[PDB]
Structure formats: C-alpha cells, structure tokens
Amino acid sequence: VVALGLDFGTSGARAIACDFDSDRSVSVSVTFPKTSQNWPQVWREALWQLLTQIPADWRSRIERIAIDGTSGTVLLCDREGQPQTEPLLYNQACPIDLADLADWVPADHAALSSTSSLAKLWFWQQQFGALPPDWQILAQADWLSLQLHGCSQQSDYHNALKLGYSPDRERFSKNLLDSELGALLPVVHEPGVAIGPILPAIAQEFGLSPDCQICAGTTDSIAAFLASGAHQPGEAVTSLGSTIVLKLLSQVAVSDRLTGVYSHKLGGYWLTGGASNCGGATLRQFFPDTELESLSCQIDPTKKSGLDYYPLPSRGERFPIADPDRLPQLEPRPENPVQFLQGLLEGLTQVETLGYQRLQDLGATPLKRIWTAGGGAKNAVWQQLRQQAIGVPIAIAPNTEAAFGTARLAAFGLAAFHS
Numbered sequence: 001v002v003a004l005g006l007d008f009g010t011s012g013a014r015a016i017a018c019d020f021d022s023d024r025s026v027s028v029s030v031t032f033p034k035t036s037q038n039w040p041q042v043w044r045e046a047l048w049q050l051l052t053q054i055p056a057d058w059r060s061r062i063e064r065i066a067i068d069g070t071s072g073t074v075l076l077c078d079r080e081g082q083p084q085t086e087p088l089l090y091n092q093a094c095p096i097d098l099a100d101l102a103d104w105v106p107a108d109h110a111a112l113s114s115t116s117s118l119a120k121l122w123f124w125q126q127q128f129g130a131l132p133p134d135w136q137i138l139a140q141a142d143w144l145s146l147q148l149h150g151c152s153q154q155s156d157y158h159n160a161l162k163l164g165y166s167p168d169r170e171r172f173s174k175n176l177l178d179s180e181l182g183a184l185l186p187v188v189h190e191p192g193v194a195i196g197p198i199l200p201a202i203a204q205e206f207g208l209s210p211d212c213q214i215c216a217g218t219t220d221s222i223a224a225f226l227a228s229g230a231h232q233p234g235e236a237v238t239s240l241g242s243t244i245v246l247k248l249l250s251q252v253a254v255s256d257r258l259t260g261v262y263s264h265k266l267g268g269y270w271l272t273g274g275a276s277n278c279g280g281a282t283l284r285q286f287f288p289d290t291e292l293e294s295l296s297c298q299i300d301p302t303k304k305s306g307l308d309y310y311p312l313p314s315r316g317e318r319f320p321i322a323d324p325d326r327l328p329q330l331e332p333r334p335e336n337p338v339q340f341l342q343g344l345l346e347g348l349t350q351v352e353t354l355g356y357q358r359l360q361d362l363g364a365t366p367l368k369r370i371w372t373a374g375g376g377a378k379n380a381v382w383q384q385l386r387q388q389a390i391g392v393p394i395a396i397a398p399n400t401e402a403a404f405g406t407a408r409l410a411a412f413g414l415a416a417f418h419s
Ligand SMILES: Nc1ncnc2c1ncn2[C@@H]1O[C@H](COP(=O)(O)OP(=O)(O)NP(=O)(O)O)[C@@H](O)[C@H]1O
Pocket: 239, 240, 241, 242, 243, 279, 280, 281, 282, 283, 284, 289, 292, 293, 296, 373, 374, 375, 376, 378, 379, 382
C-alpha cells in the first residue's frame, strides 16, 4: 500500500509518502514562521504546500493519509471548522483552577494540567462565558485532517486523552459529556482507522485518488515512537536529545502523580514513559558537539570514572524522581575533560536506567530492548555505558521521523499492537 504521513511539529511540517511493498519513499518539508497572526492559515497552507511538493506520480498512487500534530495545540471552531479565536498552542498554559476539572475526569487524570486541551477548553468557556453547542474544539491533527475529509468533531484517542478522554474505558465521562462542554467534544476513533474518503475537490485539485482514505491521526511524540517500528511489550525508544525522553511499550497502563507519568492506549497495548530534566543541554553547557565527539572517543566505558554525577542543567528534577529542589551534582571536577565528560555520560546513563526501572516498578512490562533516537544516539561510548548499566540490547532506531511513523500509521494502523 502507498501511504502518506503528515507531521506537524514544533517548528515545521514534513510529508513522507511511502510505498511499503517496494520500500520506496519521498520526503518533503516546510519550515514554520517564527511569528504569525494567523497560525491556522499557516498550518493549512503548509498542508497544501506539502501536498504540492509531492510528485504527481506519488499523489496518484496514495491510498491512505494520516496526520500527527503537537499535543495540546487546540482550536475553537464553528460547526464548519472556522477558528473563532487564536489557537492555544502546546506550550501555552492557562491560569485556572484545576479543581474545576476534578468532577469531569478521574483522580490524577492526565488532563489535569494547565497546558492540557481540557484546561484550554475550560479557559475558553470562562473567556467566552458561554460556548455555542454547535461549536467544536479540535486538536491541530484533528483540524488538519478535517481539511481533507470534511467530517467535523472527529479526533483520536491519543489526542483526546488530555482533553479528558479515558482510553481504558474508551469514553469521556458522563459528567463531562452532560456538562456545557460536552457538545464541543469530538467523536473519538482509534488512530489509523479510516474516518472517511478524501474530499472530491481536494482529490481533483491535487491529483489524488478520489478513493483515498483519510485516517484518524495522533500526536508527534507517539508518531516518533511509531517510526521505530517497535510493537512488542517491553520494547522502548530512548530519545537522547536536549532532554532525555523515555517511551516504553507495556501490556499494562502505568501512571504516577508526582512525576507526571501517564500512559496512552496503543491498540491492545499501552505506551508509557517519562521525561527527565537531564539531557544533552547539560552536555552543551560544557562542550559543543565537535568536542563531544573528539572527547567521547577517548573514553573507556569499562573503567568507572569514580564520579557520581546527577547531570541536571539546573535546579529541579521532574523524572524519574520528582524533587523541585534537586541541584546539579557535578562534583568533584576532574582536571581531565575526558574524565569529566565520562562522568556526565555515566550520570545521564543513570538517569535512563533509573527511569526505565522506575517505569517497571510502577507496573510496566519489563524492558526487552532499547531503540535510540536524538542527538546522543550516535554516541557509541554512551551507548556502551547504557547497555552495561541497563542490561538489554540497545541499538539506533531504524527510523525516527514522526512523518514516517505517521505513514506507517496510515498504512497499517495499530494492528501490530495486539497479542
Ligand atoms: N556525540 C554526541 N554525544 C552526545 N550528545 C550529543 C552528541 N552530539 C550532540 N549531542 C547533544 O544532542 C543535543 C541535541 O539533541 P537533538 O535531539 O538533536 O535536539 P533536540 O533539541 O533535543 N530536538 P529533538 O530531536 O526533538 O529531541 C544537544 O544538547 C547536544 O549536546
């Protein structure tokens, strides 16, 4: 099958069209502006740009399309999907009383945060006073796929989670549904399932098959996990970027209030994980990348540095163990920078080790292996430290592009995530 994955991320958008029987693909990109007074227009026009940059040869063969977008980026729209106010982005928080939400979701639900879609919907309820029942709240992914299939009030259970959806019982609460916010809530499908065929006009315009299907979308983080291809419980993806982000495939849902850990449903499985404040930014505080390569190649990982660092960039850890007063420990400082770097790397290694072990201690399926992404993935000394301390096979993820994970989502859905 020839499938299209569309990735709308934090700084840009990428389209990856894949023929999965000949292992062939084309990838195009668009970079977002630094500022805009009409972000919906930016996104939509980026969509048309991406479609346009895909060769006519491919567009005619594409049978399924899916879209991932940033989590917590929502739009308030009329019944035709026309934005009625500025979007609230993923990074923006809302000044409200999370106790106003407790009667709508279970205790410690992931939607109980000032940056969640539900908090933003409530914020809009307060700001507008009363929201017209024919209106709708749509995640970025939702709104963009709506541009293709014309079916309003449609979302997926990845995006809908922080809007107050409960993927364990697969529903919004009756309280929330019967509230004044209920009428703006979307119908929630599984990521990957066909919502409807592409619009006739859109198909004509862009030389797409009028029989092409638009699927339910997902978030860019989950899409990144999908890029790896991991589908057995116990498999994980570690992102060694500016911050270390762990994602672990589990047979069981796990969560933790104080560390903010939660789980998304993923087929018959669950994707859990957590994000540390430690990461590559700490490394950046002492070495540029070139120095990281040159010095890391001088490290022998089979000899302990003697150093026991907690490589926070600044004060306060969020995961594996919450502690808003945790200070960076980088003492004592050896005079050899090779040894200092080794100490830092051992520290970050301990962060990943503790993180995964903690996820398991909360009930998650025991770790089977690690696929690695992000800036530190290529560092084989760091990788060695990690395999020593964790004790599972570790490799570089076969693919890490969110658009590719989304193309896989379009082509195969979540079928692989079942026993
Ligand atoms: N050889 C290396 N070994 C270890 N860390 C490295 C190396 N090269 C770069 N880094 C770190 O990689 C970090 C950048 O990670 P990168 O993933 O590319 O960016 P990002 O901001 O995290 N965006 P994302 O890819 O979504 O996580 C920087 O802080 C670098 O210090």
